[PDB]
Amino acid sequence: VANATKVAVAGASGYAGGEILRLLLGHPAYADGRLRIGALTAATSAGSTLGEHHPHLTPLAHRVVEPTEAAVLGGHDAVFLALPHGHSAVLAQQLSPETLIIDCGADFRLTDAAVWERFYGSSHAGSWPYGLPELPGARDQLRGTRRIAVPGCYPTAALLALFPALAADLIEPAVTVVAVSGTSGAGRAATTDLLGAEVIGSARAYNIAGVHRHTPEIAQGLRAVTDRDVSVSFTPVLIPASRGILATCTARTRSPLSQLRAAYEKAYHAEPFIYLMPEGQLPRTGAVIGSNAAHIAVAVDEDAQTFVAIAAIDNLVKGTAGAAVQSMNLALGWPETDGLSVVGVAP
Numbered sequence: 001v002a003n004a005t006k007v008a009v010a011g012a013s014g015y016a017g018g019e020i021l022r023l024l025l026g027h028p029a030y031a032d033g034r035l036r037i038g039a040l041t042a043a044t045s046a047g048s049t050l051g052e053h054h055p056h057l058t059p060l061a062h063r064v065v066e067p068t069e070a071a072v073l074g075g076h077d078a079v080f081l082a083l084p085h086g087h088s089a090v091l092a093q094q095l096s097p098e099t100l101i102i103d104c105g106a107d108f109r110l111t112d113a114a115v116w117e118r119f120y121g122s123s124h125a126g127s128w129p130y131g132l133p134e135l136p137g138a139r140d141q142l143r144g145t146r147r148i149a150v151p152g153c154y155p156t157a158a159l160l161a162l163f164p165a166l167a168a169d170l171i172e173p174a175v176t177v178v179a180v181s182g183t184s185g186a187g188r189a190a191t192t193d194l195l196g197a198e199v200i201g202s203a204r205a206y207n208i209a210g211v212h213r214h215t216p217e218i219a220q221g222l223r224a225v226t227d228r229d230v231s232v233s234f235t236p237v238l239i240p241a242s243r244g245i246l247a248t249c250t251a252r253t254r255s256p257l258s259q260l261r262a263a264y265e266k267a268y269h270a271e272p273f274i275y276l277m278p279e280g281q282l283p284r285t286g287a288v289i290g291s292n293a294a295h296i297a298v299a300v301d302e303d304a305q306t307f308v309a310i311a312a313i314d315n316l317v318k319g320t321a322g323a324a325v326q327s328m329n330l331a332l333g334w335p336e337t338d339g340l341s342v343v344g345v346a347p
């Protein structure tokens, strides 16, 4: 059990960095003095105050953003990396080795070098314990870890929706995922196609037909629960919301619905963040915003011989920062649910 942890956040001015800070402010270790918020770093934002970026985080508004450098990041027991991929290997190498390093990007997520290279165009750096505690065998690798690779947002929703059925061998291993997402998932770098005037009142699929980099990440998590050949058709759709992922996940099945439901019960009955919808209810992203919860319902389309699983998460909490803090709690030997509410902020 960690006694006193001074935390830095690299990429503090971005959405993921902002959300880590929000959750750390609400964490009971912050309140009782055991967790201390240190250096807040970025690139070009350095020299500005945090309030200029995250006006919702008023207790920290006056903090001056510092450059993202080893000298600034030194002397922290834990360092969150909330930066675009391709910096954390370089950066992680510069930090004291015993630092708990929690990487929100993709660099340490994937376990196959040829898959990595294909989708990311660089040499594979390797892999770190995957920050999705609810996956079979995941929680054990996170306890006492000094290294965490936080999952992508879409794979979190897809894996939670699909792994129990596939693990029980109750569906075919060719899965289809169509997931809608709020725009905060795309980050805070200004581009035309993320402007409000463009996104408000409009929906669009993007990176379709296997080009999205989260495709192999879904396939990897699934391959860990079955011996069968997994395929993934993944289509992300940007919708006019700031937060939220609703993943619609399908696969061929000939199994009774009651057996599929039993597989979800077994997987999730004692998982505090997973909420199985009551009969006749279905998830909505509105219900999970600002919580670390995933709300899940499953069904069978008999005419179509198709299993349907719906999963809703907050992309910034269970999809990113909440996953990071949940995994942090595990790494430090603190109660896993600390700082992480299952109650949504709705309407």
Ligand SMILES: NC(=O)c1ccc[n+]([C@@H]2O[C@H](COP(=O)([O-])OP(=O)(O)OC[C@H]3O[C@@H](n4cnc5c(N)ncnc54)[C@H](OP(=O)(O)O)[C@@H]3O)[C@@H](O)[C@H]2O)c1
Residues within 6 Å of the ligand: 010, 011, 012, 013, 014, 015, 016, 017, 041, 042, 043, 044, 045, 046, 068, 082, 083, 084, 085, 087, 104, 105, 106, 151, 152, 153, 184, 185, 186, 187, 188, 189, 315, 316, 319, 320
């Ligand atoms: N947002 C999500 O829903 C989500 C979900 C899953 C994973 N992630 C991951 O989180 C990471 C950041 O995403 P985001 O959505 O939070 O992006 P973002 O909102 O654009 O913020 C990016 C942050 O990184 C900083 N940065 C950029 N280049 C840097 C550099 N060369 N050195 C140091 N800092 C640099 C920026 O600083 P400046 O302000 O100075 O530019 C900013 O603080 C990505 O790897 C992404 O894959 C995000």
